[PDB]
Copies of this chain bind each other. A is one copy, B any other.
Amino acid sequence: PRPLVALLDGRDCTVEMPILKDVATVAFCDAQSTQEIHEKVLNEAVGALMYHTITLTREDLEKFKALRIIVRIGSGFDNIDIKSAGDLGIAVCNVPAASVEETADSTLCHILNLYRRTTWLHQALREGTRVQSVEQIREVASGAARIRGETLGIIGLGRVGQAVALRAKAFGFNVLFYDPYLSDGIERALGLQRVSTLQDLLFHSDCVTLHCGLNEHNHHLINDFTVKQMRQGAFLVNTARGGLVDEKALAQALKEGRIRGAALDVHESEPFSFSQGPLKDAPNLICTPHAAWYSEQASIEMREEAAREIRRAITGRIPDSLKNCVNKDHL
């Protein structure tokens, strides 16, 4: 027969079918937890495709008896224990840049929304606020600032980070970044300022934007400690990973006024909701349901790509046939 491949936290396989039809048996679990995965999958599944709504711990992975590959349909793979999966002889792959630009564009939208207060002005206009005179325009739009000369501090100058830096220049932002893993000289190639430490970046930035993956070393990068290093009344943007920020610290900082405002597309606990979590009633906070990456073309693109990776894996050799394996070291 043809190897079984399962879509863990999803139920739509229309885009992948044309590509896997003759080489695999497609199936979906639409699971909201690993406990929701059926026995037949854990026993026979050779490949697996998953999104970000489900986590896979070592315990989870050990329950698969034939799993040979897990392809993340997206960028981040922090929801998967690449290490354990590797030891278990399970190759983990992702989809690197199908939405790099969708993400940079949303990032810029958040940045501008904080500086120009577009969303808040609209939200207030819906609240019935009246704005007839200039004095009232100034009051309702209070805080809107002139962007030219502001310092945008980027944390993580990777694919998205670079796309953000380039867009940022056009608005007159002075751009500087921090990324301890990059080789020296990239800052010269793109004409950007680089700093050696996080505190350095935080201290000189008027607006801080996260663009690094969530790893074993940056959990809660933004702490009650580091938040204290940020400028007074600085903006914070995060379209990377919720786990990079300690919402409790952020909430406090937002109430005290230390941070003028934050735009978050990702949160420590997703699904996100204003009714619960440390961000409840937190002042000047704009949120989005983790859609920074979305655009129909990108969704379609990343799915056909994930599908092809599965195909290469089933028809070729692991990890030789794979194009985006992220745990070769543990294999």
Residues of chain A from 100 to 127 with CB closer than 8 A to chain B in the complex: 101-102, 105-106, 108-110, 112-113, 115-119, 121-126
Q: How often does this chain occur in the complex, in copies?
A: 2
Question: Which residues on B sit within 8 Å (CB–CB) of A309?
Answer: none
Residue of B at shortest CB range from A169? B170
B105 and A294 within 8 A (CB): no
**Max chain B CB contacts within 10 Å: which of A12, A106, A292?**
A106
Q: Within the assembled complex, what's the spacing in Å between the Cα atoms of A124 and B132?
A: 27
Q: Within the assembled complex, what's the spacing in Å between the Cα atoms of A10 and B135?
A: 8
Question: Which residues on B sit within 8 Å (CB–CB) of A295?
Answer: 144-146
Question: Which residues on B sit within 8 Å (CB–CB) of A169?
Answer: 170
Asked whether A286 is an interface residue with its Cβ less than 8 Å from the other chain, the reply is yes
Question: Which residues on B sit within 8 Å (CB–CB) of A110?
Answer: 118
B53 and A121 within 8 A (CB): no
Q: Within the assembled complex, what's the spacing in Å between the Cα atoms of A147 and B11?
A: 28
Q: A134-B53, A170-B167 are in contact. Are A101 and B294 (CB under 8 A)?
A: no
Q: A133-B53, A297-B146 are in contact. Are A291 and B121 (CB under 8 A)?
A: yes
Asked whether A18 is an interface residue with its Cβ less than 8 Å from the other chain, the reply is no
Question: Which residues on B sit within 8 Å (CB–CB) of A123?
Answer: 119, 122-123, 126
Q: A53-B133, A119-B119, A133-B10 are in contact. Are A138 and B288 (CB under 8 A)?
A: no
Asked whether A32 is an interface residue with its Cβ less than 8 Å from the other chain, the reply is yes
Please count how many residues in chain A sit with their CB below 8 Å of the partner chain's CB atoms.
69
Name the contact of A144 in the complex, choosing from B53, B118, B134, B291 (C-beta under 8 A). B291
Q: Within the assembled complex, what's the spacing in Å between the Cα atoms of A117 and B35?
A: 34
B53 and A298 within 8 A (CB): no
B131 and A271 within 8 A (CB): yes
Q: A105-B171, A135-B11 are in contact. Are A122 and B51 (CB under 8 A)?
A: no
When each residue 11-29 of chain A gets 1 if its CB lies under 8 Å from chain B and 0 otherwise, what string results?
1100000000000000000
Residue of B at shortest CB range from A30? B133
Q: Within the assembled complex, what's the spacing in Å between the Cα atoms of A226 and B133?
A: 32
Asked whether A308 is an interface residue with its Cβ less than 8 Å from the other chain, the reply is no
When each residue 249-274 of chain A gets 1 if its CB lies under 8 Å from chain B and 0 otherwise, what string results?
00000000000000000000011111
Question: Which residues on B sit within 8 Å (CB–CB) of A282?
Answer: none
Name the contact of A116 in the complex, choosing from B109, B130, B290 (C-beta under 8 A). B109
Name the contact of A137 in the complex, choosing from B116, B118, B289 (C-beta under 8 A). B289
Which A residues are closer than 8 A to B by beta carbons? 9-12, 32, 51-53, 101-102, 105-106, 108-110, 112-113, 115-119, 121-126, 129-138, 140-141, 144-148, 166-167, 169-172, 270-274, 286-292, 294-299
**5 additional contacts (CB under 8 A) given A108-B112, A136-B289, A167-B167:** A9-B134, A101-B172, A106-B116, A109-B118, A118-B288
Q: Which 6 A-B pairs have the closest CB atoms?
A: A131-B289, A141-B291, A109-B112, A132-B271, A146-B295, A170-B170
